[PDB]
Design a protein around this nucleic acid. Structure first.
Ligand SMILES: Nc1nc2c(ncn2[C@H]2C[C@H](O)[C@@H](COP(=O)(O)OP(=O)(O)OP(=O)(O)O)O2)c(=O)[nH]1
Length: 639
DNA sequence: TGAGGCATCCGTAGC
DNA sequence: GTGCTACGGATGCCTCA
């Protein structure tokens, strides 16, 4: 079976291992974390858990042999020289081509850099990203799930360890009451052989170029982002919280003085029984007596002031109960930079290809919205995200990215001609719908126009479009058919995509990633329409995500070949004025960068150029770089 | 037969 | 019957005293 070889305590064996490791061009290094249940002797401490330590590594390069490097203090080779050799063997020198294979690459990168002090810089392979690339809408892979599906022969090796069931590497988890050496070696072996199998399957499926050109470098950029962390104030959040609490108290007092009956706003039954039947306000067509949602109250805001007040109350509460407490609970002092930041946890296992943050979900911070205090106070929570002192947020978003991708994929000559020239379409359709002049639109009206346009692109209509359109169904359908007649490319693209998905069973992104939609053949009109809508949405959203990833990796390369300094806020922990192009957040269309006010004039170019040359499309890509002292007040930048 | 803990769904937000 | 995601709170359902 396994042939674990301890490289420590032997000198000739250590030198042989070093030379063979340097000769080999494909590693399978894996970490090994253990408990302190019996410091500075057994290993290196880990940030976030003081009860766990890192002991050693398991390196495999073929067969069932898993060499075990030891970082333990436990004498010809001391800790310093072993660390020196370990760092030297993990760096690219003289076009040395290597392919490191790590399970859960981001976590291992962070653990090695922050604790041990080693930043591996080579070509990475993760036997959990390729599995997603194969089937994008499966469960999050586990070591047991990978071994069962791709390396069944070594399946009996995974016996006695129940930690493989969870979504975490075998060596990193501190449970199972096993020695870290054995878990690390077994992991190493499995993630090498199964990764060989995955590479074979990827080459068969023609997805290896995407895997090694745009996916793993994107994971590296995400690791840098998670090391950086978005800044925080804790001085503006309290101000907004106090203002919102005062407004909530005012709303409650006004409701009490108006109706005179206890409400319990969170209780839908009480609201229905005191609003739909008590205080007039007849309900719509459809305990559980009447529906109380945003749409039903929006349809009768003007009839009575009370529904508007309760909608305002619910909207304000769904900013302190869901956006204020999560941020205030999750903060870090970050002594080096002298400010409180917040470090999210990314996830790239989404169905389309987008990246979502899950602790907290920073991509859902509420926008700016006015308020009345018996003039608007601008209580937006985005005002509390600030850069390091002497820094500026340098956001850079594509303008109409999905629309441009759709124009490129549809070959609509008229739409391409419209988009290539400098003009606007969403504002124009908003003004035409609201009869105001074309050069006049509100921000909420802009958002509503975006919703309407993307809905009619994705195939909605009939009664659904009417509620947001505020118009009858007949003229709405007339407008829909007229637009379909003057957007021939869009309808032809929809028909072609549906037919191709019917023929093949999968829709292919512009880069090559494909998603499987069996529901196309569901024989049920509702589910068939849902699957067609999924295909049409995916073929564009995945393309947008891939273009954003290409832009991210290109920007990272361009600002890493320049600006000689630490690559991230986590790299300076391994020890100078802060100067660089740090990457802090991605909003599915934007790349927030935390730039000091000395490289901005350069970075605002390097970003704006590199986002424009990411993919050669028929329609030119537009980038709107905006600079500001905070995520709330972002003013446009000339260049 | 009543009560407490857990699995599930809903309505909100962003893109 | 617009799609992707996260998530705190409401609402049963199952189980135990
Ligand atoms: N508002 C809205 N956006 C959607 C919808 N479906 C997809 N999106 C996608 C389209 C784009 O890829 C992305 C929008 O990203 P942004 O809001 O950052 O675009 P941006 O504001 O920079 O430009 P824009 O206002 O759209 O002209 O979200 C939808 O139903 N509503």
């Amino acid at each position: 079976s396994l042939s674990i070889i301890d490289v420590a305590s032997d000198q000739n064996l250590f030198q042989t291992f070093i030379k063979e490791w340097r000769c080999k061009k494909r590693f399978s290094i894996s970490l090994a974390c253990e408990k302190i249940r019996s410091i500075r002797d057994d290993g290196f401490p880990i940030k976030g858990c003081d009860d766990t330590l890192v002991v050693g590594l398991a390196v495999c390069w073929g067969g069932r042999d898993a060499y075990y490097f030891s970082l333990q203090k436990e004498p010809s080779l001391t800790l310093k020289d072993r660390m020196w050799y370990l760092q030297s063997c993990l760096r690219k020198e003289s076009d040395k081509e290597c392919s490191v294979v790590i399970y859960d690459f981001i976590q291992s990168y962070k653990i090695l850099l922050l604790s041990c002090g080693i930043s591996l810089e080579q070509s990475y392979e993760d036997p959990k990203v390729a599995c997603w690339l194969l089937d994008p809408d499966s469960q999050e892979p586990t070591l047991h799930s990978i071994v069962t599906s791709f390396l069944p022969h070594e399946l009996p090796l995974l016996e006695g360890m129940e930690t493989s069931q969870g979504i975490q590497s075998l060596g990193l988890n501190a449970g199972s009451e096993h020695s870290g050496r054995y878990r690390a070696s077994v992991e190493s072996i499995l993630i090498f052989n199964s990764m060989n199998q995955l590479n074979s399957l990827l080459q068969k499926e023609n997805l290896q170029d995407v895997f090694r050109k745009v996916e793993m470098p994107s994971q590296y950029c995400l690791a840098l982002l998670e090391l950086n962390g978005i800044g925080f104030s804790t001085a503006e959040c309290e101000s907004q919280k106090h203002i919102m609490q005062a407004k909530l108290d005012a709303i409650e007092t006004q409701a009490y003085q108006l109706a005179g009956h206890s409400f319990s706003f969170t209780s839908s039954d009480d609201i229905a029984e005191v609003l739909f039947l008590e205080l007039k306000l007849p309900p719509n067509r459809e305990g559980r007596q009447f529906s109380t949602s945003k749409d039903v109250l929006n349809k009768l805001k003007a009839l009575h002031p009370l529904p508007g007040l309760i909608l305002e109350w619910r909207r304000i509460t769904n900013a302190i109960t869901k956006v204020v407490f999560p941020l205030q609970r999750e903060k870090c002092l970050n002594p080096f930079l002298g400010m409180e930041r917040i470090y999210p946890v990314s996830q790239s296992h989404t169905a389309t290809g987008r990246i979502t943050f899950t602790e907290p979900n920073i991509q859902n911070v509420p926008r700016d919205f006015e308020i009345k205090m018996p003039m608007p106070f601008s209580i937006s929570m985005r005002h509390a995200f600030v850069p390091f002192p002497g820094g500026s947020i340098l956001a850079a978003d594509y303008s109409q990215l999905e629309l441009r991708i759709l124009a490129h994929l549809s070959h609509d000559r008229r739409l391409i001609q419209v988009l290539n020239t400098g003009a606007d379409v969403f504002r124009s359709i908003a003004a035409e719908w609201k009869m105001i002049e074309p050069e006049s639109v509100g921000d909420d009206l802009r958002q509503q126009a975006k919703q309407i346009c993307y809905g009619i692109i994705y195939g909605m209509g009939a009664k659904s479009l009417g509620e947001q359109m505020g118009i009858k169904e007949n003229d709405a359908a007339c407008y829909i058919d007229s637009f379909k007649s003057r957007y021939t490319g869009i309808n032809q693209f929809m028909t072609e995509t549906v037919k191709n998905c019917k023929r093949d069973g999968f829709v292919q992104t512009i880069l090559g990633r494909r998603r499987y939609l069996p529901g196309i053949k569901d024989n049920n009109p509702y589910r068939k329409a849902h699957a067609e809508r999924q295909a049409i949405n995916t073929i564009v959203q995945g393309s947008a995500a891939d273009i954003v990833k290409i832009a991210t990796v290109n920007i990272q390369k361009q600002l890493e070949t320049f600006h000689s300094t630490f690559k991230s806020h986590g790299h300076r922990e391994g020890m100078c004025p802060i100067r660089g192009g740090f990457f802090i957040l991605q909003l599915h269309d934007e790349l927030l960068y935390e730039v000091a006010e000395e490289d901005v004039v350069q970075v605002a170019q390097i970003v704006k150029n590199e986002m424009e040359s990411a993919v050669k499309l028929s329609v030119k890509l537009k980038v709107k770089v905006k600079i500001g002292a905070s995520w709330g007040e972002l003013k446009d930048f000339d260049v």
